[PDB]
Amino acid sequence: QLTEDQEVVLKQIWTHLFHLWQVPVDGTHIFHLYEKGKIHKALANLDPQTTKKQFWHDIKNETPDATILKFIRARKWNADKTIAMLGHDLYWRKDTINKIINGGERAVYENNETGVIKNLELQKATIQGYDNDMRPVILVRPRLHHSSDQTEQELEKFSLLVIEQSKLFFKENYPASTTILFDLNGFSMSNMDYAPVKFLITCFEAHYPESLGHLLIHKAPWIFNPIWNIIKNWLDPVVASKIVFTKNIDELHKFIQPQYIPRYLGGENDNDLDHYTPPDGSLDVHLKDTETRAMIEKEREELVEQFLTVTAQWIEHQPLNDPAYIQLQEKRVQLSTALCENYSKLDPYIRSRSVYDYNGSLKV
Amino acid at 80: D
Partners of residue 218 on adjacent β-strands: 183, 246
Q: How far is CA 40 from CA 30, 46, 92, in A?
A: 16, 10, 17
**C-alpha span between 153 and 147 (Å, rounded):** 12
Residue 310: Cβ-neighbour burial (10 angstroms; 0-12, 13-18, 19+): middle
Residue 58: Cβ-neighbour burial (10 angstroms; 0-12, 13-18, 19+): middle
Query: Superfamily for 104-265?
Result: CRAL-TRIO lipid binding domain (3.40.525.10)
Q: How far is CA 177 from CA 22, 102, 172, 181, in A?
A: 32, 20, 11, 13
Q: Diameter of the chain by CA atoms?
A: 65
**C-alpha span between 265 and 262 (Å, rounded):** 6
- φ/ψ of 239, rounded to 5, equals -60, -45
Instruction: Please name the residues in contact with 9: beta carbons below 8 A apart, sequence gap of 6 or more.
Output: 72, 77, 79, 82
**C-alpha span between 346 and 58 (Å, rounded):** 13
**C-alpha span between 171 and 179 (Å, rounded):** 14
**C-alpha span between 237 and 241 (Å, rounded):** 6
DSSP type of residue 95: T
Q: How far is CA 52 from CA 58, 79, 119, 189, 312, in A?
A: 10, 20, 34, 46, 15
Amino acid at 159: S
Resolution (A): 1.5
Residues 67, 59 contacting (CB under 8 angstroms): yes
- φ/ψ of 309, rounded to 5, equals -70, -35
**C-alpha span between 116 and 159 (Å, rounded):** 9
**C-alpha span between 238 and 45 (Å, rounded):** 31
**C-alpha span between 122 and 118 (Å, rounded):** 6
In 3D space, the residue among 214, 204, 277 whose CA is nearest the CA of residue 242 turns out to be 214
Instruction: Please name the residues in contact with 316: beta carbons below 8 A apart, sequence gap of 6 or more.
Output: 25, 26, 27, 29
Strands 212-218 and 178-183: parallel
C-alpha 33: how far from its chain's center?
32
**C-alpha span between 271 and 268 (Å, rounded):** 9
Residues 2, 10 contacting (CB under 8 angstroms): yes
Residues 119, 144 contacting (CB under 8 angstroms): no
- φ/ψ of 173, rounded to 5, equals 75, 15
Residues 42, 34 contacting (CB under 8 angstroms): no
**Region of residue 134 (phi > 0: left; psi between -120 and 50: alpha; otherwise: beta):** left
**C-alpha span between 364 and 346 (Å, rounded):** 10
> Within a 10 A sphere around the Cβ of 197, how many other Cβ atoms?
15
Method underlying the structure: X-ray
Q: Domain extents for the chain?
A: 4-94+286-358, 104-265
> Within a 10 A sphere around the Cβ of 305, how many other Cβ atoms?
12
**C-alpha span between 298 and 259 (Å, rounded):** 41
Amino acid at 346: L
> Within a 10 A sphere around the Cβ of 333, how many other Cβ atoms?
12
Residues 10, 69 contacting (CB under 8 angstroms): yes
Residue 169: Cβ-neighbour burial (10 angstroms; 0-12, 13-18, 19+): buried
Strands 243-246 and 212-218: parallel
Alpha-helical regions (H) of 187-289 = 194-207, 225-231, 237-240, 249-253
Residues 328, 313 contacting (CB under 8 angstroms): yes
